[PDB]
Design a protein around this nucleic acid. Structure first.
Lengths: 210, 200
RNA sequence: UUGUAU
């Protein structure tokens, strides 16, 4: 309208400047819930299950959420530690035909969703990267390698935007840590290729401290 | 349908769609590493933090993304880009730089399509180290580098200064190869993984 | 520490 106030919006397109709110770690409350044990009792049991499942429902589709907070204006990724030395992002396997984002909201709620009844919604608007697994082996890559026509798994990473305050419940078998970016950066020996390239995957975001 | 924040579709075209001529050499303002950091200090005191922008132009070959790199010698590769002028707009500046380095000289309008930021790197000191985040307690970074995805038109003519060679590097060549390309180019594969690339 | 460019 030319007969009224102009409500000024961010000028650059969201493709060019994507602004994201980070709140302090101390804004969040953490509790404990029942342990979530893995579907696989060992490595062998797991690439075996991965082969079997591949034959009768196709390529495995995984989604994972990157949750970010800050401490004195420095971004930290929330990582689940499966006992000493092993870290994973929240997320997991999509059901057949399941929407990626609906699937990740499902999985975020299972792993970290509060128990006390206060409903906790997840804001998931951004894809931050993609990883493919060309064989039934541990190795993954941020592209589909040459001559790979039937990748065995496809993993999609998403930025999960947190509310100003929230309560999370951590399954008993896990510890939650907040890893600063300098800790992840150039540290594949500590976190693997996927987690340790998060700093890079996060660098395009214009973070707001609060 | 899907927010361009959730899904970003980009059209790639074959390398052969593009033809590469040459023009007169375009020499860097600094002739050595030593002079580069010397000039970084002057301009720092004078006009403040260096604002640098660079362009990632992608093509495909048999359905695999290749990034175009300017090879200055047998061991050094750079992305099209450069230093912004004080106050100058980032995308406007980047367009200016891409035309200097790669713009055809046959009078034809070359319009660069720059819609997407793909990363940021900061240089805390007047030394080589760059990080994809402002490191802890660095209040005054000396350089801020910003990377953009440039969507190429369907066919184009580019003119490469006789002192550079343009190359198309497949992602598997860049990935896990900081030793060959540095920390910035060698992580373009990760930075590019989010895009849904259409082959044509 | 991808760096001098015949």
């Amino acid at each position: 309208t030319q007969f009224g106030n102009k409500y000024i919006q961010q000028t650059k397109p969201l493709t060019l400047e994507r602004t994201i709110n980070l709140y302090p770690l101390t804004n969040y409350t953490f509790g404990t819930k029942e342990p979530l044990y893995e579907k696989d009792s060992s490595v062998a049991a797991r690439f075996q299950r991965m082969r079997e499942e591949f034959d009768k429902i196709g390529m495995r589709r995984t989604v994972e959420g990157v949750l970010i907070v800050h401490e004195h204006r420095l971004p930290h990724v929330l990582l689940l530690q499966l006992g000493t030395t092993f870290f994973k992002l929240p997320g997991g396997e999509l059901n057949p035909g399941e929407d990626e984002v609906e699937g990740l909201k499902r999985l975020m709620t299972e792993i970290l969703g509060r128990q006390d009844g206060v409903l906790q919604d997840w804001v998931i608007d951004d894809c931050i990267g993609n990883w493919w697994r060309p064989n039934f082996e541990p190795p993954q890559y941020p592209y589909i390698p040459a001559h790979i026509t039937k990748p065995k798994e496809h993993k999609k990473l998403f930025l999960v935007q947190l509310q100003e305050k929230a309560l999370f419940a951590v399954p008993k078998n896990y510890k939650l840590v907040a890893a600063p970016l300098f800790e992840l950066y150039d540290n594949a020996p500590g976190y693997g290729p996927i987690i340790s390239s998060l700093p890079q995957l996060l660098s395009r975001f214009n973070f707001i401290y609060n």
